[PDB]
Design a protein around this ligand. Structure first.
Ligand SMILES: *[C@@H]1O[C@H](CO)[C@@H](O[C@@H]2O[C@H](CO)[C@@H](O[C@@H]3O[C@H](CO[C@H]4O[C@H](CO)[C@@H](O)[C@H](O[C@H]5O[C@H](CO)[C@@H](O)[C@H](O)[C@@H]5O)[C@@H]4O)[C@@H](O)[C@H](O[C@H]4O[C@H](CO)[C@@H](O)[C@H](O)[C@@H]4O[C@H]4O[C@H](CO)[C@@H](O)[C@H](O)[C@@H]4O)[C@@H]3O)[C@H](O)[C@H]2NC(C)=O)[C@H](O)[C@H]1NC(C)=O
Ligand SMILES: *[C@@H]1O[C@H](CO)[C@@H](O[C@@H]2O[C@H](CO)[C@@H](O)[C@H](O)[C@H]2NC(C)=O)[C@H](O)[C@H]1NC(C)=O
Ligand SMILES: *[C@@H]1O[C@H](CO)[C@@H](O[C@@H]2O[C@H](CO)[C@@H](O)[C@H](O)[C@H]2NC(C)=O)[C@H](O)[C@H]1NC(C)=O
Ligand SMILES: *[C@@H]1O[C@H](CO)[C@@H](O)[C@H](O)[C@H]1NC(C)=O
Ligand SMILES: *[C@@H]1O[C@H](CO)[C@@H](O)[C@H](O)[C@H]1NC(C)=O
Ligand SMILES: *[C@@H]1O[C@H](CO)[C@@H](O)[C@H](O)[C@H]1NC(C)=O
Ligand SMILES: *[C@@H]1O[C@H](CO)[C@@H](O)[C@H](O)[C@H]1NC(C)=O
Ligand SMILES: *[C@@H]1O[C@H](CO)[C@@H](O)[C@H](O)[C@H]1NC(C)=O
Ligand SMILES: *[C@@H]1O[C@H](CO)[C@@H](O)[C@H](O)[C@H]1NC(C)=O
Ligand SMILES: *[C@@H]1O[C@H](CO)[C@@H](O)[C@H](O)[C@H]1NC(C)=O
Ligand SMILES: *[C@@H]1O[C@H](CO)[C@@H](O)[C@H](O)[C@H]1NC(C)=O
Lengths: 97, 95, 133, 271, 133, 121
């Protein structure tokens, strides 16, 4: 139950993190359980959400466990809750602008 | 009154992981890049393979937790790195 | 050669332990069961790593078999298939009727049964074969 | 400590234009071990497999990597199988096998960086038709199934990538998933990219220019990898893939390595 | 070859002697026994080395396939070994002095070879029923 | 199948106990020195099978530790048997028994050989 505040437009870096340093598969979903952003092996993938063109991630940090989510062009309608599922640690971070 | 027996020749299983050795019918002359890799790190195929059908046995498998899929994944990283040598890599180091 | 018989033991799984010990007597007789091409100098050291790799298996199939029958030979009997010894069966090793063992259980069940006690019997089989000598 | 410097290095080897034809490599088990084939045919990968044989080596598995498809694999025997770790999770790659190979012809004709893959229509419409039969088993044989394109990401997983002859094709499988199933041929606009993302580790790779002649590819599609999107319904199956483990959890699903322990003890009434 | 290939041939000494004379030699013979070119130096190390190790492990697995067969019958390592199977008198019906004094093993084995499968079944069963009860 | 079975054997009570516990191009470099490590193993198998026939003639086949019915003579290095297992290495035996090991092997022949005829009667 983390708290993240933005203004508008800026890049927020939500973060889930494992303890392995070996690029394990994660995902990122929202409150309606639609995929935001996902890892598939060594490639990135999106999901058919309404953040599909705006979401991003830092590719070089996956090899150290850190699996961020970087969102551009913060509107008002993305003020929701987001869920990172690494293997079990379904951490929820909520966002507001 | 009952005394402990010992039998040799019993069909007993034991869940455990090991290192599986590869086998394929490489040619040892062809410069196709898999027939090169399957000569340094393989063995000729089984000429007369042994296969036994087991009666009455039930057995629980699992696909998503197999430990030989990560042994196929290793020997194909090791294939392509000695097979498709690239002109420019860009591997993040992250000190 | 020998690695063929190491897997032929498994033909009696799924059956009952009275029947599988009887099949083992038939299996006892069933456990009694070439690169000559023009080789270039490039094929010479490549068909020889194909020779050593197969011959590191045929000696492992021999060396596993002698590491079995070194452990049996500690427990009195070397080369016996069916071997019973002079240790009394303790009652605390998953007590059950003897008709409730050799008639309605497969051999894989005994892996689930007495694997908590399998190390304790092995020390007893050493000691009683050492106490009797 | 948070924005730590990551030196993106660049090692440059000596790169010729080498051939690439994957041969079947089958994994044997060492001495004192065995491999248990699962000879069932409704086998969805998990659970108790009721007919189990024991083999030392498996079938000639072809190491054929791809995204969004599974070329040159091995077929089923009864029907199209739909395997997943946890279905109704919407985060697990639904594997699919084919009991018939949808053949795909793919050639670079005579631009250098352009190719086309040809797949026969209505061998694909019946095979999309077989999949929406067994898919409705795990659903209420309703909630109209709508195939669609990918969502985005890397170019390696939003298009069917493979590598035939040495060149790294990137085919736009967008006509293959455009239907919606209520209750002649197709041409695909491939490229040949030179700056790819490696599937092996994290990193990019730049390769030599494509070869001069013609490049043929005769592959037999024996598998898909889909993915749903759980809204709040139609259950749209946006295809994907890219973790290469899933290309070999669809030819090593019927195997298991065990250890043979041929010394047992039991009570007997002997003397 | 240079291992246990000489032992299988050393058994064949003192054929044509009497069966008492071979038995005296049984326990005592198995007590006493068991170029300036770089190209030839390569093959003498690499492919002529493998091909003599494919014949030394052939003589091992020929030997262990013999001492395993004596293990079903119960002996397994004793060169002279006698069992509990009673000799049927319809097996050549010959005098025991007529056999061990003046008969060679080759002359003896030609007499018995009609039914040596039938003897080999009894010695397995008798060692299956002496470890059963 | 052991030819070494070492495990750094120094003290004899630790040597006896652990014995029951433990033993219970560039292709030319690796093919010449792979055959050398197969001649190590295949000889160390044939050294075992030659040895287990020698213990089989004495009657002690298979058993690692075996006890037998031949007592010491007077000229077989009469030291006290309690300090012998206390402070001595196994290496110091073959120094300490020099020419007695050939007649010990002869007496262990006849101890079994007379026993094979004794139970025969
Ligand atoms: C699923 O599995 C199937 C296997 O069943 C895979 O199909 C394979 O695909 C690869 C990739 O294209 C094929 O390799 C290439 O095949 C080309 C076509 O060759 C065939 O036709 C010609 C003309 O009739 C014949 O001459 C060929 O005969 C050759 O093959 C036989 C064995 O079948 C050999 O024994 C002979 O000696 C012949 O050599 C075939 O019948 C072929 O052009 C190509 O060879 C060129 O390409 C490679 C690099 O790609 C070069 O290293 C090679 O030296 C050749 O290069 C010359 O030609 C090119 C022109 O293309 C020039 O640009 C070069 O500069 C140079 O001059 C190679 O053989 C393979 O044949 C095929 N397997 C078959 C059909 O059984 C699928 O790919 C697989 N799916 C996936 C996704 O991988
Ligand atoms: C498969 O995935 C579903 C989610 O789609 C899991 O179901 C959830 O289980 C948790 C248990 O903590 C509940 O709190 C959720 O409400 C469930 N969600 C739904 C949609 O059912 C299910 O547990 C997964 N299967 C396994 C075996 O873990
Ligand atoms: C793959 O092909 C499809 C099919 O054309 C492309 O999708 C769009 O298709 C419509 C046809 O109704 C065109 O008008 C658009 O120009 C296409 N593109 C977009 C971005 O809408 C699809 O773009 C192709 N894939 C790639 C990577 O170009
Ligand atoms: C696989 O089959 C087992 C029983 O055979 C069943 O319990 C399980 O739910 C199935 N899983 C899928 C994904 O079909
Ligand atoms: C194409 O599919 C057929 C089965 O119809 C199969 O026999 C053949 O091997 C396949 N071709 C490949 C794998 O190259
Ligand atoms: C691919 O399909 C197009 C249109 O159907 C056709 O013109 C072309 O010749 C085909 N190419 C091959 C190699 O089949
Ligand atoms: C596929 O075939 C079915 C009949 O089996 C038909 O109703 C459907 O229209 C076909 N698909 C397309 C895209 O025409
Ligand atoms: C097909 O995919 C492209 C990008 O992958 C996208 O622009 C287009 O809208 C997709 N078509 C449909 C019908 O989803
Ligand atoms: C050859 O025959 C004679 C006469 O029967 C016999 O005395 C002799 O022992 C035989 N030779 C040998 C070497 O035994
Ligand atoms: C013994 O076997 C031979 C063939 O090897 C046969 O001709 C002969 O009749 C048999 N004798 C007896 C008594 O069975
Ligand atoms: C070596 O000597 C020390 C001191 O007595 C002893 O503790 C140690 O166990 C010895 N090493 C071995 C391998 O027995």
């Amino acid at each position: 139950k983390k708290v993240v505040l933005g203004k508008k437009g800026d890049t927020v870096e939500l973060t889930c993190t494992a303890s392995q340093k070996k690029s394990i598969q994660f995902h990122w979903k929202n409150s309606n359980q639609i995929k935001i952003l996902g890892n598939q092996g060594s490639f990135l993938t999106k999901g058919p959400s309404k953040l599909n063109d705006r979401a991003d991630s830092r590719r070089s940090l996956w090899d150290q466990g850190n699996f961020p989510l970087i969102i551009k062009n913060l509107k008002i309608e993305d003020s929701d809750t987001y869920i990172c599922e690494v293997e079990d640690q379904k951490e929820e971070v909520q966002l507001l602008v | 009154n009952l005394w402990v027996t010992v039998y040799y020749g019993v069909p007993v299983w034991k869940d455990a992981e090991t290192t599986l050795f590869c086998a394929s019918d490489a040619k040892a002359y062809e410069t196709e890049k898999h027939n090169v890799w399957a000569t340094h790190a393989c063995v000729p195929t089984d000429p007369n393979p042994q296969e036994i059908h087991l009666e009455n046995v039930t057995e629980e498998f699992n696909m998503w937790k197999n430990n030989m899929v990560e042994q196929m994944h290793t020997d194909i990283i090791s294939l392509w790195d000695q097979s498709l040598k690239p002109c420019v890599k860009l591997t993040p180091l992250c000190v | 050669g020998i690695g063929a018989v190491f897997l032929g033991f498994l033909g009696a799984a799924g059956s009952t332990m009275g029947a599988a010990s009887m099949t083992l007597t038939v299996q006892a007789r069933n456990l009694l069961s070439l690169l000559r091409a023009p080789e270039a100098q490039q094929h010479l050291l490549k068909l020889t790593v194909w020779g050593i790799k197969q011959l590191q298996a045929r000696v492992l199939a021999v060396e596993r078999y002698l590491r079995d029958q070194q452990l049996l030979g500690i427990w009195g009997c070397s080369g016996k298939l069916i071997c019973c010894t002079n240790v009394p069966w303790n009652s605390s090793w998953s007590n059950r009727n003897l008709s409730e063992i050799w008639d309605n259980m497969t051999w894989l069940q005994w892996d689930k049964e007495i694997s908590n006690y399998t190390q304790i019997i092995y020390g007893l089989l050493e000691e009683s074969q050492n106490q009797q000598e | 400590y948070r924005l730590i410097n990551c030196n993106t290095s660049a090692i440059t080897q000596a790169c010729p234009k080498v051939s690439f034809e994957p041969i079947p490599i089958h994994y044997c088990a060492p001495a004192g071990f065995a491999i248990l084939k699962c000879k069932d045919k409704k086998f969805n990968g998990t659970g108790p497999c009721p007919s189990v044989s024991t083999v030392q080596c498996t079938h000639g598995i072809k190491p054929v990597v791809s995204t969004q498809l599974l070329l040159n694999g091995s077929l089923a025997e009864e029907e199209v199988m739909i395997r997943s770790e946890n279905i109704t999770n919407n985060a697990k790659n639904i594997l699919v096998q084919f009991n018939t190979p949808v053949q795909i012809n793919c050639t670079r004709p005579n631009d250098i960086r352009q190719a086309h893959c040809n797949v026969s229509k209505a061998t694909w419409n019946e095979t999309l038709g077989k999949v929406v039969k067994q898919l409705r088993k795990h659903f209420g044989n309703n909630t109209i199934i709508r195939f669609a394109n990918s969502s985005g990401g890397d170019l390696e997983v939003t298009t069917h990538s493979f590598n035939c002859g040495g060149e790294f094709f990137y085919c736009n499988t967008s006509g293959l998933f455009n239907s919606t199933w209520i209750s002649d041929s197709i041409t695909l606009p491939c490229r040949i990219k030179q700056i790819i993302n490696m599937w092996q580790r994290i990193g990019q790779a730049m390769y030599a220019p494509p070869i001069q002649g013609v490049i043929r590819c005769v592959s037999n599609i024996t598998g898909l990898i889909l993915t749903r999107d759980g809204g709040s319904t139609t259950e749209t199956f946006r295809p994907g893939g890219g973790d290469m483990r899933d290309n070999w959890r669809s030819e090593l699903y019927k195997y298991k390595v065990v250890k043979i322990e041929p010394l047992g003890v039991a009570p007997t009434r002997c003397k």
